[PDB]
Design an enzyme around this catalytic site. Structure first.
Site, PDB file in Angstrom:
ATOM      1  NE  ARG A 182      -4.334   1.776   1.734  1.00 36.20           N
ATOM      2  CZ  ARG A 182      -4.948   2.774   2.362  1.00 36.20           C
ATOM      3  NH1 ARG A 182      -4.440   3.110   3.425  1.00 36.20           N
ATOM      4  NH2 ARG A 182      -6.170   3.160   1.872  1.00 36.20           N
TER       5      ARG A 182
ATOM      6  CG  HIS B 103      -1.747   5.326  -0.491  1.00 29.18           C
ATOM      7  ND1 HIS B 103      -2.712   5.566   0.741  1.00 29.18           N
ATOM      8  CD2 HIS B 103      -2.719   4.605  -1.220  1.00 29.18           C
ATOM      9  CE1 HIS B 103      -3.657   5.253   0.603  1.00 29.18           C
ATOM     10  NE2 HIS B 103      -3.886   4.677  -0.533  1.00 29.18           N
TER      11      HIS B 103
ATOM     12  CD1 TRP C 169     -11.580  -6.394   0.290  1.00 29.32           C
ATOM     13  CD2 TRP C 169      -9.510  -6.200   1.461  1.00 29.32           C
ATOM     14  NE1 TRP C 169     -11.177  -5.174   0.405  1.00 29.32           N
ATOM     15  CE2 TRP C 169     -10.079  -4.666   1.195  1.00 29.32           C
ATOM     16  CE3 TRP C 169      -8.270  -6.010   2.281  1.00 29.32           C
ATOM     17  CZ2 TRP C 169      -9.412  -3.726   1.383  1.00 29.32           C
ATOM     18  CZ3 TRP C 169      -7.479  -5.073   2.479  1.00 29.32           C
ATOM     19  CH2 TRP C 169      -8.193  -3.883   2.101  1.00 29.32           C
TER      20      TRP C 169
END
Ligand code: HEM
Length: 291
Positions: free
Chosen positions: A45, A49, A188
Site C-alpha cells: 500500500r 499511495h 477481504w
C-alpha cells in the site's frame, strides 16, 4: 515538469538486489506486525499511495520524488497507517543510504509482492528525491465509499483503463481494513499475506450483505468474516468491471501477468527513462537465492 530517471551513482542490479534482500529478510523477521499479517500488505500500500498521487495532466505527484517523507504527505488522512511501512523501511534506508526515497518506497512494494508469492514485478531505478515544496497536496488518493463511475473516473487521472484498474484492485487480497485508520474494518479474505487472486473469487462467490460498521460506514460483509469496500463491490455492479473480475477469478496466471504490468506502470508513471537507461531489473526472491 519532466522527471528523468538518474541511476544512483555507480549502482547496478546487484546493489538493488541487496536492498531487495534486506527488505525481504526484514519482512520475514518482523512477522508479528498486524496480528501476524506482517508488513507485506502495508508495504504494497505504501508503494501504491506514494505513486498514486500522480496527475497525468501536469506530472505532479507520483513516485519519482519520494515526497511521502515530508509531513504534508505522511500526514495525509488517506495515508493513515502507512507510517508503519515507512518505519519498517527506515533501517533499510540507513543501511543503504544511497538509494533514493522513491526508489525505496516503490522497491518495498515490489519486494513485498514477490516475497508474498506474487508475480515478478520488473522494477527500474532512478527516482530522484525532490524538495518539500514538490509534495502534492492531500486529496489525490481515492475515496472508498463511491461507485464504479467514481472508480473509473478516478483512475483515468493515473492513466489506468478498466483492465488495469480491476487488476490493481486485486491487491486487496492483502492485509485488511482497520477501523481507526480508514473507517472500514476487516480482511477481504483468508490468504491475506500470500498474493493470490482470492479477491476476485471472494467477490463472486461469497454471500455479501450491506452492513454498517462501528464507524457508521457501509461495507459489504460475509459470514466468513470477510469484507469489501463499496469501491471493491462496484467491480461486480458495473458490467464492464464484472467481466474482468470473472476473468481473473478464473485465470490466476492472467491476473499475475496483468497485475505485474499495471503495478510496474503505476510505480513508473511520471518518470522518463533515457534511451540508454538500464533495462528493468527482475529481482530473485529469497527463496530463489536459497536465502
Ligand atoms: C478505488 C481504489 C482504492 C480504494 C478506495 C482503496 C481503499 C483502501 C482502504 C480504505 C484500505 C484500508 C486502509 C486501512 O484501514 O488500513 C485499503 C487497504 C489496502 N489497499 Fe487499497 N484502495 C484502492 C486501491 C488500491 C490499489 C490500487 C492497491 C495497490 C495495487 C491497493 C492496496 C491496498 C493494500 C495492500 C491494502 C491493505 C493495507 C494494510 O493491510 O495495511 N489499494 N485500501
Amino acid at each position: 515538469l519532466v522527471h528523468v530517471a538518474s541511476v544512483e551513482k555507480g549502482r547496478s542490479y546487484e546493489d538493488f538486489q541487496k536492498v531487495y534482500n534486506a527488505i525481504a529478510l526484514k519482512l520475514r523477521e518482523d512477522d508479528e506486525y498486524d496480528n501476524y499479517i506482517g508488513y507485506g500488505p502495508v508495504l504494497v500500500r505504501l508503494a501504491w499511495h506514494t505513486s498514486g498521487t500522480w496527475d497525468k495532466h501536469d506530472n505532479t505527484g507520483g513516485s519519482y520524488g519520494g515526497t511521502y517523507r515530508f509531513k504534508k504527505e505522511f500526514n495525509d488522512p488517506s495515508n493513515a497507517g502507512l507510517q508503519n511501512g515507512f518505519k519498517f523501511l527506515e533501517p533499510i534506508h540507513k543501511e543503504f543510504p544511497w538509494i533514493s526515497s522513491g526508489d525505496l518506497f516503490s522497491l518495498g512494494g515490489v519486494t513485498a509482492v514477490q516475497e508474498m508469492q506474487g508475480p515478478k514485478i520488473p522494477w527500474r531505478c532512478g527516482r530522484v528525491d525532490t524538495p518539500e515544496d514538490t509534495t502534492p497536496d492531500n486529496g489525490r488518493l481515492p475515496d472508498a465509499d463511491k461507485d464504479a463511475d467514481y472508480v473509473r473516473t478516478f483512475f483515468q487521472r493515473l492513466n489506468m483503463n478498466d483492465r488495469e484498474v480491476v487488476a490493481l484492485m486485486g491487491a486487496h487480497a492483502l492485509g485488511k481494513t482497520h477501523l481507526k485508520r480508514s473507517g472500514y474494518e476487516g480482511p477481504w479474505g483468508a490468504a491475506n499475506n500470500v498474493f493470490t487472486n482470492e479477491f476476485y473469487l471472494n467477490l463472486l462467490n461469497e454471500d455479501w450483505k450491506l452492513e454498517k460498521n462501528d464507524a457508521n460506514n457501509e461495507q459489504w460483509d460475509s459470514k466468513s468474516g470477510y469484507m469489501m469496500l463499496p469501491t471493491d463491490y462496484s467491480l461486480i455492479q458495473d458490467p464492464k468491471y464484472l467481466s474482468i473480475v470473472k476473468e481473473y477469478a478464473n485465470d490466476q496466471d492472467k491476473f499475475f501477468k496483468d497485475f505485474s504490468k499495471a503495478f510496474e506502470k503505476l510505480l513508473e508513471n511520471g518518470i522518463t527513462f533515457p534511451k540508454d537507461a538500464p533495462s528493468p531489473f527482475i529481482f530473485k526472491t529469497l527463496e530463489e537465492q536459497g536465502l
